[PDB]
Design a protein around this nucleic acid. Structure first.
Lengths: 92, 73, 53, 101, 112
RNA sequence: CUCAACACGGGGAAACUCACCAGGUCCAGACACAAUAAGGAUUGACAGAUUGAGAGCUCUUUCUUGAUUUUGUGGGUGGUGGUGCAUGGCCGUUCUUAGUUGGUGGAGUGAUUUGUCUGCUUAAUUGCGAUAACGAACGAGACCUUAACCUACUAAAUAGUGGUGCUAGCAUUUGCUGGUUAUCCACUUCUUAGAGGGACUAUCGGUUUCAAGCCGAUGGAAGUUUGAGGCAAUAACAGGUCUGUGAUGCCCUUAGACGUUCUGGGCCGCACGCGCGCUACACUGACGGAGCCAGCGAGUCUAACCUUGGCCGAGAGGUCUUGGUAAUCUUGUGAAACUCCGUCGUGCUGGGGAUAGAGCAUUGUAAUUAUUGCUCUUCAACGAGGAAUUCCUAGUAAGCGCAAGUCAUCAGCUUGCGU
């Protein structure tokens, strides 16, 4: 993917912010409903993460389900943020 | 369907490879040390004096825009 | 490339599709169901469509 | 006091009638005029698929039904006791809406 | 609101079937057996019927806070208006869904 | 491709569907390694050429972009590509029937057998009985849904009825027919739907071994298992489906692609043979006025669904509004056959409406290879259909339309419903 760097930042921060992405299996879907980027970018960015680890995907009823694993939460820190921040629902 | 014939002329032709010229960022340099504008800047408020207007033949064309900035001269 | 998905899909079988398998054949869109004939038959029980008479 | 209306809709007979019974039981626990449960005609929602995938075989047809039972009770009550009776009788499978006037 | 009860009651059914197929696919390794929704005012609630609740309820609230987000992202619920519970199973020796998954995973370990 | 393919794939395909044909783009080739590469890995583009094309496709030109890409090596992914004779699931069929199997005992060296049967009876391996078997299990039945009955219970301005006010007409004598969105009161026969009652072949008579049953009459809303379904064994088929599935093994392909997407076209092309049907061959009819009667249902919030009423128009249709998320409005769906009065008058005629010409509209980005509707004109075969052959036993056959599915538009199809 070309996927310009200011759109990795929107995708990767939101995955850090909540820990989950669902995103609607439909390519060329023109501005995904939660992140301000395209829906094709959301599906293909997190395919790159999944093949190397870092996130687990579930597919059901034309929808994806992305869950940030423990090897990905530590990696996504230095990509975007500083330490001692909790991505997932681990925050009580 | 057994095979393909490709009656079109045998075109495995591809795009220009974002044509690799030499170093090109040159306003012009005089001796010690000044520099002056050539291939002048754009009239766009969103082009903050950093873009070069190509002059092909009686055209001034900006590349910051996707398609079209025509201040022709 | 500005012609990539440019054909309109606003009516007819190309626009609608199943919400379980994304097919265009045998769709049921009564009461806004939008499930194929074969998919609906496998999960009519979960929706609440039982077979009495 | 205020004129109220409670509308009940479900697909289960046994789970709905006892909820309306609790509504009326709380209605004459502290007495007030009933306009008791007026049962609307039951709705049968029919889906007639064929039987199969691919069309091989005798042309056999199925019909599936969902039954919608609807009941509305037109009460009047003081403003205080409205919230408690609308919140106590909450049961799975029964959809309750309350119209203010 | 502003939807007819014919389309409302059907949409509740397809919502349940989508949830059920999600948890069969997701909680396959935890012996999932079913769900039921309780559509109430003020946070409609969902109960998960799975044998190993100590696995479904992950470490320190993970693995069900994740599933709470996954449901409300996909079904466009307001935050905090859905909660997910896990009470275990009523006599797992008598559920055919749970005994088929037991039969399935025993086969995948190379049992005769 | 016999039943068990041929209005079947919910298959009524203008694009989309779409798998096929002539062509054009794109990667949506993840990751790992190696190379190029901040003296720039790469990306995008105005105008012109070019192209079906306002595709920067590709080229001319010279701007932009910046480390995500590119190239190569392995892979990854997708596939309505193959194999249904490698499979799952689903379905059809054997099979509109009554059938199937353990345990213990008995017979036989054994495969197997008896149980599971001479007779009678039943829709039924349903029973009475007989009995080297006894006691059982599934199927049938029982069960569930639905249609019939309830002047009984529970009450209903989202269903009615009667009285009452106000009011219209006619008669006038106190009556009859109406209107009045809640004017008010009362009630639940009709309507609705919860809980129930009700049929058990009841009573009587006749038949048989005197049993299981059967037949006739009476009563009853109901006497065929009360009617109709739903459900539905053991064993199977090389039955159908990989073109329902992000069900799936193996094979193939994977960048000039069999992926995907876009413009066009095709699936509808006609010497001809077959299957399901529609309209007919007229007087028990056609046409014109007039009467006027259903039941099942469907319907729109961030989207234009069902549409009343007024106005315009020959019509199709248009327009201004309205009601309805619905026992409330469309809708009493004022359906059609049917009924009454008249015109026709035994003539392929005023039966029939194929084929064709011209116009007006509607859906749609788009109607040519007529989408469909309407108006005028054109007026074909067909005079009751050979051998064959289908379906059907009572609110059934047949006639007659209506709603829904498919749908944006298209119903000569189907699923139901009533007359």
């Amino acid at each position: 993917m070309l996927m310009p760097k200011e759109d990795r930042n929107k995708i990767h921060q939101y995955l850090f912010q909540e820990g989950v992405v669902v995103a609607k299996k439909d390519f060329n879907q023109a501005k995904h409903e939660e992140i301000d980027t395209k829906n094709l970018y959301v599906i293909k960015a997190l395919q790159s993460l999944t093949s190397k680890g870092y996130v687990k995907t579930q597919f059901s009823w034309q929808y994806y389900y992305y869950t940030l694993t423990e090897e990905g939460v530590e990696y996504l820190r230095e990509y975007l943020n500083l330490p001692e921040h909790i991505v997932p629902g681990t925050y009580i | 369907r057994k095979k393909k014939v490709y009656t079109t002329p045998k075109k495995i032709k591809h795009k220009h490879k974002a044509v690799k010229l030499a170093v090109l960022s040159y306003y012009k340099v005089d001796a010690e040390g000044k520099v002056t504008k050539l291939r002048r800047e754009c009239s766009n408020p969103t082009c903050g004096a950093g873009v070069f207007l190509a002059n092909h033949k009686d055209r001034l064309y900006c590349g910051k825009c996707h398609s079209v900035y025509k201040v022709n001269a | 490339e500005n012609v990539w998905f440019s054909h309109p899909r606003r009516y007819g079988k190309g626009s609608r599709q199943c919400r379980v398998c994304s097919s265009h054949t045998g769709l049921i869109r009564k009461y806004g169901l939008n499930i194929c004939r074969q998919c609906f038959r496998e999960k009519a029980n979960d929706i609440g469509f039982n077979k009495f008479r | 006091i205020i004129k109220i209306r409670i509308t009940l809709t479900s697909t289960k007979v046994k789970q709905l009638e006892n909820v309306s019974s609790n509504i009326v039981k709380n209605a004459e626990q502290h007495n007030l005029v009933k306009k008791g449960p007026v049962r609307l005609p039951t709705k049968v929602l029919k889906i007639s698929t064929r039987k199969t995938p691919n069309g091989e075989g005798s042309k056999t047809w199925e019909t599936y039904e969902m039954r919608i039972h609807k009941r509305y009770i037109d009460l009047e009550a003081p403003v205080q006791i409205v919230k408690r009776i609308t919140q106590i009788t909450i049961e799975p499978g029964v959809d309750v809406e309350v119209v203010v006037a | 609101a502003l939807i007819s009860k014919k389309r409302k009651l059907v949409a509740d059914g397809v919502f349940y079937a989508e949830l059920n197929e999600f948890f069969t696919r997701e909680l396959a390794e935890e012996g999932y057996s079913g769900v039921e929704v309780r559509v109430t005012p003020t946070k409609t609630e969902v109960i998960i019927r799975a044998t190993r609740t100590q696995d479904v309820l992950g470490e320190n609230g993970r693995r069900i806070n994740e599933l709470t987000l996954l449901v409300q992202k996909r079904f466009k619920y307001a935050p905090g208006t859905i909660v997910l519970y896990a009470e275990r199973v009523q006599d797992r020796g008598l559920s055919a869904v749970a005994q088929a998954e037991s039969m399935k995973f025993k086969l995948l370990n190379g049992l005769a």
